[PDB]
């Protein structure tokens, strides 16, 4: 089989070039109003085929900047915007996630919600298109729905623990005795709301012989019922721009890398191949309380915090064994510099963060922290 650089190459290889299209693609937009701009240009074009050509961006009537870094920077603002819980298409998956699910109620803070998620679908499928990458992460499930494949009891694990549990009992155990039913109780806005997994649900007990369509049941609400017409908007655009047996060589933790860049940065493989300059070992007090700092961060700030010293947020594949820095083979480096005052540097041509000798690990995190804010 072919690991995930072999199988993007080979997806690279297969997205042909159009021919029968204008050279360039161009769309002039202004910062305030990104969002609208964006879609009626990118909605508006007579065939999504365009939408592939070069990008010609043009923000606020700015002459003479260079067009490839200005596309880069609108994707990151277009993301900001589209992906903004504020606009009721979006929505954090939980209270205590990070994480992206459209928003059941979309509909009811859009009604043209729709074409907006067709559009948001167009964007993504351009990112994909031009080698770029979008800013924000979607729940597991969202990733599975775009390659159709099942969504499973563990896809909650990393969305509802709690609701991961009481399942996975449900799933080992004769829930028979507690006289379940097949409804969700959902609470909000200080009431509870029973809805039926199926018709007469109610009236319904949940046991060995019907508890696997009951699970499954749940898992589709949760996921999947509420949201079948916007995601179909969503897949619907993206596919004008990459046609959906292609990007299916992919699976959800190789999808999720291809447009969003984002994964799980093992954080142990990280530590071990690191060198230590000027005075710093690993059992170092202050690289001590580094580790401890980078343990605790969350997926978002583990990849800017590599962004920021490596120049990418890329992670070579086989580890931090095989970084390259500017000149070759360069090993994630921590140097000792400074004054406890200033905030760590980032040296990107040698994958080196120079960090002062902080006398807090507290303070070790807020200046960190902030150095990582501006990249
Ligand atoms: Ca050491």
Redesign the pocket.
């Known amino acids: 089989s072919r690991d995930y650089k072999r199988k993007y190459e080979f997806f690279r290889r297969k997205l042909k070039k159009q021919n029968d299209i204008p050279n360039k693609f161009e769309m002039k937009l202004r910062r305030a109003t990104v969002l609208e701009d964006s879609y009626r240009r990118i909605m508006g074009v007579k065939r999504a085929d365009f939408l592939k050509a070069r990008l010609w961006i043009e923000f606020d009537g700015e002459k003479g900047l260079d067009y490839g870094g200005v596309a880069r920077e609108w994707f990151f603002l277009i993301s900001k915007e589209m992906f903004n819980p504020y606009y009721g298409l979006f929505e954090y998956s939980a209270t205590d996630n990070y994480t992206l699910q459209i928003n059941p109620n979309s509909g009811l803070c859009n009604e043209d919600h729709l074409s907006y998620f067709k559009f948001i679908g167009r964007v993504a499928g351009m990112a994909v298109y031009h080698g770029k990458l979008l800013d924000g992460f979607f729940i597991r499930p969202f990733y599975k729905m775009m390659l159709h494949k099942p969504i499973t009891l563990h896809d909650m694990e990393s969305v509802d623990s709690e609701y991961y549990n009481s399942l996975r009992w449900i799933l080992e155990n004769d829930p028979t005795e507690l006289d379940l039913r097949f409804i969700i109780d959902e609470e909000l806005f200080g009431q509870t709301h029973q809805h039926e997994l199926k018709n007469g649900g109610s009236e319904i007990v949940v046991t060995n012989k019907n508890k696997k369509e009951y699970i499954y049941l749940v898992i589709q609400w949760r996921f999947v019922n509420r949201i079948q017409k916007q995601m179909a908007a969503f897949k619907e655009g993206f596919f004008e721009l990459i046609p959906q047996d292609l990007i299916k060589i992919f699976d959800e933790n190789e999808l999720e890398l291809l447009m969003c860049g984002l994964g799980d940065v093992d954080v142990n493989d990280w530590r071990e191949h690191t060198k ?1 300059k000027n005075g710093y ?3 170092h007090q202050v690289i001590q309380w580094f580790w401890k700092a980078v343990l605790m961060m969350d997926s978002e700030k583990r990849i800017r915090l590599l962004q920021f010293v490596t120049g990418t947020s890329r992670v070579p594949m086989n580890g931090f064994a095989e970084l390259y820095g500017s000149n070759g083979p360069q090993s994630f480096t921590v140097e000792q510099w400074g004054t406890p005052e200033k905030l760590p540097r980032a040296h990107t041509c040698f994958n080196r963060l120079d960090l002062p000798p902080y006398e807090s690990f507290e303070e070790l995190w807020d200046k960190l922290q902030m150095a990582i804010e501006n990249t």
């Open positions: 230590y070992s690993a059992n």
